[PDB]
Amino acid sequence: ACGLVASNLNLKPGECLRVRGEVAPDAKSFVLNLGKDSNNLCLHFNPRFNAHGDANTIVCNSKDGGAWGTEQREAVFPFQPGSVAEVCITFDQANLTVKLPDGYEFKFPNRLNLEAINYMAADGDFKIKCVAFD
């Protein structure tokens, strides 16, 4: 609830969500939130450069009716402060797939078994320049 908020996205399984934005030069962390609304998130995507005692680690979680699920920590960190990052997200019944820069990718389980993604929110040290659906 500080960066761009979009609702009625109507993202369907198999469709690709493309997001391009600027990572702040003094970036500590940023957040991409996806799901039904702010209380129901299939993906809380949180690259931490230096925040909460995490350094250069992507933290992923879900939110079910207002309650945070269990955190998953990724093995890769293809982000750098002061640079233009692009993120592509697609999903199906079992998994979200996140494609990062430099050919990196990961899966995160679809814990809420959502069939549409209608909500997206950005927060922290990341400024969206572009959102595309294909």
Ligand X SMILES: OC[C@H]1O[C@@H](S[C@@H]2O[C@H](CO)[C@H](O)[C@H](O)[C@H]2O)[C@H](O)[C@@H](O)[C@H]1O
Please say whether the dihedral angle defined by the alpha carbons of residues 20, 129, 18 and 13, taken in this order, is positive or negative. positive
The one-letter code for the residue type at 60 is: C
Stretch that binds its own copies, among 26-34, 44-52, 71-79, 122-130 (CB under 8 A): 122-130
Minimum distance between the CB of residue 45 and its own copies, rounded to whole angstroms?
18
Nearer to ligand X, 107 or 129 (CB): 107
How many Cβ atoms are within 10 Å of 104's Cβ, its own excluded? Answer: 15
**Whole-number minimum distance, CB 48 to ligand X, in Å?**
8
Question: Binding site annotation covers 47?
Answer: yes
Q: Is 103 helix (H, G, I), strand (E, B) or coil?
A: helix
The option from ligand X, its own copies, none interacting with 71 (CB < 5 to 8 A, set by class) reads ligand X
Q: How far apart are CA 8 and CA 2, in angstroms?
A: 18
What is the dihedral sign for C-alpha 31, 55, 111, 63? negative
What are the Cα distances from residue 90, in Å, to 23, 45, 58, 72, 106?
Answer: 22, 13, 18, 18, 11
Among 5, 55, 76, 84, the residue binding its own copies under the rule CB under 8 A is 5
44 labelled as ligand-binding?
A: yes
Q: Which of residues 44-73 bind ligand X (CB under 6 A)?
A: 44, 46, 52, 59, 61, 68, 71
Residues found near ligand X in the complex (CB under 6 A): 44, 46, 52, 59, 61, 68, 71
- Known binding residues for a beta-D-galactoside are 44-48, 52, 61, 68-71
